[PDB]
Design an enzyme around this catalytic site. Structure first.
Site, short mmCIF file in Angstrom:
data_model
loop_
_atom_site.label_atom_id
_atom_site.label_comp_id
_atom_site.label_asym_id
_atom_site.label_seq_id
_atom_site.Cartn_x
_atom_site.Cartn_y
_atom_site.Cartn_z
N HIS A 36 7.36 -3.62 9.97
CA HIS A 36 8.29 -4.69 10.30
C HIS A 36 9.00 -4.77 11.63
O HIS A 36 9.97 -5.50 11.74
CB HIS A 36 9.32 -4.75 9.19
CG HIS A 36 8.72 -4.83 7.83
ND1 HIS A 36 8.03 -5.94 7.38
CD2 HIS A 36 8.66 -3.93 6.82
CE1 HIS A 36 7.57 -5.72 6.17
NE2 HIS A 36 7.94 -4.50 5.80
N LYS A 82 -2.88 -8.51 4.48
CA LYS A 82 -1.64 -8.65 3.72
C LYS A 82 -1.36 -10.15 3.69
O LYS A 82 -1.60 -10.84 4.67
CB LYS A 82 -0.47 -7.91 4.40
CG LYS A 82 0.74 -7.74 3.46
CD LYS A 82 1.85 -6.90 4.10
CE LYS A 82 3.19 -7.04 3.37
NZ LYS A 82 4.21 -6.05 3.90
N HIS A 141 13.14 -0.78 3.59
CA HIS A 141 12.51 -1.89 2.89
C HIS A 141 13.01 -3.24 3.41
O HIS A 141 14.21 -3.46 3.60
CB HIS A 141 12.82 -1.77 1.40
CG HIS A 141 12.47 -2.98 0.59
ND1 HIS A 141 11.18 -3.24 0.16
CD2 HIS A 141 13.24 -3.99 0.11
CE1 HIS A 141 11.18 -4.35 -0.55
NE2 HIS A 141 12.41 -4.83 -0.59
#
Length: 118
Positions: free
Chosen positions: A11, A38, A112
């Site tokens: 990310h 993805k 996350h």
């Protein structure tokens, strides 16, 4: 730790040149996200320190249950899988946006990216 390390490989891209479909296809490939492709992935740009700070009150607030939401807004680029095929060539459509991010923090570091807002 490894999760935070993983969070960044998936990310984070400090300074992206161009944020179009071509960038998405390129960076998803370079970061190991194309086998299989993805379906959706967001990249946060900017200084690592501000992303890290979302984990404290310095730049973040409690959100949901165990999530945190950034107090400031970030330049982001989401890559959406175009088509059906789960295998390469993985074609993506980019959307260069700007807003607060939601992450889960562990021992002080983001581990996350809640991609529910992408």
């Amino acid at each position: 730790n490894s999760r935070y390390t993983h969070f960044l490989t998936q990310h984070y891209d400090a300074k992206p040149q161009g944020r179009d479909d071509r960038y998405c296809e390129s960076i998803m490939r370079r970061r190991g996200l194309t086998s299989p492709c993805k379906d959706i992935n967001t990249f946060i740009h900017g200084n690592k320190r501000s992303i890290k700070a979302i984990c404290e009150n310095k730049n973040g607030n409690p959100h949901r249950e165990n999530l945190r939401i950034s107090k400031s807004s970030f330049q982001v680029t989401t890559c959406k899988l175009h088509g059906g095929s789960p295998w390469p060539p993985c074609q993506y459509r980019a959307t260069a946006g700007f807003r607060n991010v939601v992450v889960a923090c562990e021992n002080g570091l983001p581990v996350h990216l809640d991609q529910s807002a992408a």
